[PDB]
Amino acid sequence: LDTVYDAIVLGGGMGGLSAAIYLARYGLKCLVVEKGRGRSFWMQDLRNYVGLDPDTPGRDIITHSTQQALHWGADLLRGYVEDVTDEGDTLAVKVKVGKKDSLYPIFRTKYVIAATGIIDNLPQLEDMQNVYDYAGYTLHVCMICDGFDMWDQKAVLIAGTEGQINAAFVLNWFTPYITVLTHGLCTVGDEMKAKLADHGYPLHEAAITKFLGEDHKMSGVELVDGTVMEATTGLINMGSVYHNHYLKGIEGLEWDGENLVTNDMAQTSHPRIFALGDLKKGLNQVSVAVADGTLAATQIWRNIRRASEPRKWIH
Amino acid sequence: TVYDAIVLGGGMGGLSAAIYLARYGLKCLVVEKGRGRSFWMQDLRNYVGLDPDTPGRDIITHSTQQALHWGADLLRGYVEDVTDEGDTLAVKVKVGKKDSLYPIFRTKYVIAATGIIDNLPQLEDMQNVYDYAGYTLHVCMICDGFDMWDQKAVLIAGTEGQINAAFVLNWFTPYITVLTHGLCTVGDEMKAKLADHGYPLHEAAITKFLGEDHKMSGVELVDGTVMEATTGLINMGSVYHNHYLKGIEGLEWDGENLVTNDMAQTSHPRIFALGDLKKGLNQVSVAVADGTLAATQIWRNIRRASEPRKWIH
Numbered sequence: 205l206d207t208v209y210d211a212i213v214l215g216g217g218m219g220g221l222s223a224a225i226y227l228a229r230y231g232l233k234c235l236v237v238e239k240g241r242g243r244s245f246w247m248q249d250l251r252n253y254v255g256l257d258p259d260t261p262g263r264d265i266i267t268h269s270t271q272q273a274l275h276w277g278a279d280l281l282r283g284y285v286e287d288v289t290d291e292g293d294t295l296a297v298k299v300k301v302g303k304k305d306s307l308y309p310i311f312r313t314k315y316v317i318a319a320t321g322i323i324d325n326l327p328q329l330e331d332m333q334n335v336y337d338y339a340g341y342t343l344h345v346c347m348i349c350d351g352f353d354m355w356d357q358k359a360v361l362i363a364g365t366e367g368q369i370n371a372a373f374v375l376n377w378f379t380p381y382i383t384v385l386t387h388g389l390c391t392v393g394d395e396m397k398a399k400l401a402d403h404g405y406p407l408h409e410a411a412i413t414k415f416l417g418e419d420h421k422m423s424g425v426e427l428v429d430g431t432v433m434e435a436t437t438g439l440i441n442m443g444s445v446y447h448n449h450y451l452k453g454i455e456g457l458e459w460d461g462e463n464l465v466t467n468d469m470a471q472t473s474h475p476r477i478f479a480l481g482d483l484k485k486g487l488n489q490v491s492v493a494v495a496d497g498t499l500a501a502t503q504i505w506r507n508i509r510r511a512s513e514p515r516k517w518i519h
Numbered sequence: 520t521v522y523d524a525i526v527l528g529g530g531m532g533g534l535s536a537a538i539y540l541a542r543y544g545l546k547c548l549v550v551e552k553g554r555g556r557s558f559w560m561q562d563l564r565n566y567v568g569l570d571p572d573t574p575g576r577d578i579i580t581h582s583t584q585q586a587l588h589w590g591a592d593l594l595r596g597y598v599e600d601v602t603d604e605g606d607t608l609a610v611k612v613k614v615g616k617k618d619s620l621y622p623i624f625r626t627k628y629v630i631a632a633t634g635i636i637d638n639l640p641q642l643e644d645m646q647n648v649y650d651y652a653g654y655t656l657h658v659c660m661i662c663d664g665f666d667m668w669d670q671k672a673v674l675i676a677g678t679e680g681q682i683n684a685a686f687v688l689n690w691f692t693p694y695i696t697v698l699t700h701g702l703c704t705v706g707d708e709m710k711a712k713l714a715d716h717g718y719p720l721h722e723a724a725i726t727k728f729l730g731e732d733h734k735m736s737g738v739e740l741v742d743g744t745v746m747e748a749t750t751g752l753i754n755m756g757s758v759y760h761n762h763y764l765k766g767i768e769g770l771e772w773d774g775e776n777l778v779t780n781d782m783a784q785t786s787h788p789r790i791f792a793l794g795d796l797k798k799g800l801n802q803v804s805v806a807v808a809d810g811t812l813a814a815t816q817i818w819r820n821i822r823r824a825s826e827p828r829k830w831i832h
């Protein structure tokens with residue numbers, strides 16, 4: 205009944221587990237809520253993170269850091285965050301527990317760390333397994349992450365909107381051999397079609413029917429209109445769904461598009477809510493998310509420490 | 520002939536920057552002197568993905584190999600000076616310890632990632648300190664506070680500002696004894712505050728750390744004082760490895776730290792600063808992320824000034 209957590213970490217991914225590790229090692233009472241199978245879970249090769257081999261899967265990191273978090277004293281709840289509500293001095297966090305016959309317990313806490321990230325939109329094919337066979341292997345979702353591994357390859361840019369097609373003029377740094385596929389989504393305007401033609405990047409607007417290859421290595425793409433092309437890699441640039449629905453009930457949050465605006469310690473405009481990694485305005489990388497968790501946990505500790513009574517040595 | 524970026528220091532922040540720079544297709548040089556602060560870290564306690572007993576030296580070997588794998592160049596040397604040539608910077612490196620040469624490299628950008636090194640109490644034989652420093656004698660409260668919880672500890676602090684750490688360390692344990700190691704006499708006001716909190720104060724120089732297998736058991740002072748303690752925190756300041764910036768104009772400082780923006784960029788346009796050199800928390804995670812942001816800003820600068828790569832048909 206009375207039990208109030210010092211902080212509840214929403215999402216047990218890269219940024220969340222870092223925050224959880226620090227929170228527990230600051231002697232604070234914290235809870236991690238993880239639904240499972242998040243974005244980092246679909247990462248097959250973490251390419252650019254100090255200390256880890258460049259073929260480490262995200263799932264192995266999640267397993268490692270979850271055990272570490274528990275080892276230091278964090279609590280873990282496997283469930284789905286539904287809503288966060290403001291009770292003034294504390295926040296209330298409702299969690300869906302159980303996929304079938306679910307229970308919706310409510311937890312109270314001094315602080316919330318929003319670390320639930322995003323999930324990339326994928327092209328909808330008749331059988332999504334054809335996409336999963338390559339997505340995260342040779343079909344990439346993050347240019348910073350895998351650009352080097354695409355160098356001078358024949359690539360496809362899968363982009364739904366005119367703003368998403370503009371990535372071709374950054375991706376060309378890594379390879380000029382870009383073919384744009386709209387997957388039959390928004391029609392391309394004349395001004396953009398002329399720019400692509402001026403750069404030499406072919407454009408195909410027919411819906412994609414199948415990705416060709418074997419052993420997770422792309423070899424080509426086929427469209428509904430019979431078009432067939434050769435390509436050994438690609439970039440998905442179709443936007444993302446943001447895992448921030450539980451914040452509907454919170455007032456006073458400041459946004460930059462779909463991203464939360466945070467200060468240097470990853471604090472939102474709401475004094476008791478922090479936001480990490482892919483949810484916040486800034487670069488979307490593992491290293492950046494882990495550091496956000498470090499700073500958020502440290503700011504929370506500083507708040508709680510400075511409001512507590514000094515621990516004196518009684519003689 | 521001209522590097523896209525030169526990374527000064529091949530530690531936590533520098534090797535991250537080098538990894539990203541190389542994977543951005545940029546020509547970058549890492550200058551590493553060897554045996555830095557992270558080299559003396561025995562257990563990285565709080566870093567996502569790594570076991571909490573991982574030594575810093577093992578990380579350096581791993582990430583240096585990765586940096587080289589992606590195409591970064593490595594020079595084993597000592598950065599001596601950085602000069603501003605306008606469109607580029609010149610970086611002089613001492614190569615060779617006994618018979619040295621001073622080659623000069625030019626670059627569009629410099630990443631200052633040479634960190635700091637903690638001051639240690641000077642004993643007759645420094646090995647007595649090294650036996651415990653980084654094991655049970657800590658230099659970073661955030662790093663090892665949890666591992667000190669409710670233990671009898673010593674705070675080794677030279678100045679009144681350094682003694683003030685006792686009023687943050689008390690969060691982890693109230694059983695703090697302050698040792699000034701005979702460096703600065705403590706004022707009456709601070710003596711009264713320590714007494715009110717119950718933290719004993721000893722001002723005599725330390726002679727020996729007691730214990731076995733890197734596990735502290737006590738401390739002995741020159742005046743014969745002996746005490747029991749299983750851990751401690753060194754708070755005697757640090758030497759900053761930023762001497763090579765003496766000639767540069769337009770840099771902003773906060774104390775000994777360089778002031779940087781969100782992409783770890785210093786007030787000078789072509790100089791970035793990472794990790795322990797910059798104002799902010801001193802952690803591995805923070806340093807690694809700084810290297811990510813610096814490398815990404817440099818790439819954006821160079822990319823946006825380059826000509827688009829077109830597909831010729």
Ligand SMILES: Cc1cc2nc3c(=O)[nH]c(=O)nc-3n(C[C@H](O)[C@H](O)[C@H](O)COP(=O)(O)OP(=O)(O)OC[C@H]3O[C@@H](n4cnc5c(N)ncnc54)[C@H](O)[C@@H]3O)c2cc1C
Nearest residue numbers: 238239240246282283284300301302303323324336339340
């Ligand atoms: C590069 C990449 C590769 C991918 N590869 C694959 C793949 O190979 N196979 C695959 O399946 N997917 C893959 N995905 C993910 C896929 O695209 C979909 O996003 C995913 O299948 C959605 O899962 P879901 O429908 O369960 O949605 P979720 O949002 O995970 O769940 C939907 C609902 O389930 C309930 N729920 C979820 N978790 C819990 C819980 N712990 N407790 C209680 N209730 C819960 C909630 O009501 C929730 O709203 C990949 C994604 C990417 C970006």
Ligand SMILES: Cc1cc2nc3c(=O)[nH]c(=O)nc-3n(C[C@H](O)[C@H](O)[C@H](O)COP(=O)(O)OP(=O)(O)OC[C@H]3O[C@@H](n4cnc5c(N)ncnc54)[C@H](O)[C@@H]3O)c2cc1C
Nearest residue numbers: 215217218219239242244251285320321340481482489490
């Ligand atoms: C294929 C692929 C490869 C990549 N490669 C790299 C790389 O090489 N280098 C790099 O820096 N970055 C890479 N990234 C991106 C990187 O994974 C993200 O930037 C990083 O994971 C962000 O961390 P985060 O903690 O913000 O989000 P995540 O790590 O995704 O963590 C969020 C967690 O929250 C959980 N969650 C979501 N909603 C709810 C809810 N309602 N309730 C409870 N839990 C919830 C999710 O299941 C997930 O586990 C890659 C991404 C992909 C898809």
Ligand SMILES: Cc1cc2nc3c(=O)[nH]c(=O)nc-3n(C[C@H](O)[C@H](O)[C@H](O)COP(=O)(O)OP(=O)(O)OC[C@H]3O[C@@H](n4cnc5c(N)ncnc54)[C@H](O)[C@@H]3O)c2cc1C
Nearest residue numbers: 551552553559595596597613614615616636637649652653
């Ligand atoms: C917690 C902790 C534990 C420690 N434990 C130990 C220990 O167990 N053993 C130990 O020895 N030290 C240890 N140290 C480090 C110690 O305190 C001193 O900082 C160290 O001995 C200084 O080395 P140095 O005199 O070579 O100084 P440096 O600054 O490393 O070198 C001094 C000079 O050498 C030249 N030089 C250095 N490197 C190069 C190069 N690659 N090429 C050309 N010239 C170069 C330059 O002119 C430079 O100015 C520890 C430090 C800490 C914080």
Ligand SMILES: Cc1cc2nc3c(=O)[nH]c(=O)nc-3n(C[C@H](O)[C@H](O)[C@H](O)COP(=O)(O)OP(=O)(O)OC[C@H]3O[C@@H](n4cnc5c(N)ncnc54)[C@H](O)[C@@H]3O)c2cc1C
Nearest residue numbers: 528530531532552555557564598633634653794795802803
């Ligand atoms: C004993 C100990 C335990 C620690 N434990 C933790 C922990 O558990 N968690 C945590 O987050 N942090 C810990 N830290 C702190 C952590 O090591 C630093 O925050 C981190 O190393 C900062 O990275 P950096 O790249 O800024 O500095 P460094 O990692 O020190 O990198 C700087 C590099 O520059 C080189 N260099 C210096 N001067 C020159 C020059 N003139 N020319 C060429 N090269 C030069 C150095 O040799 C070094 O390799 C610990 C520190 C110590 C001493």
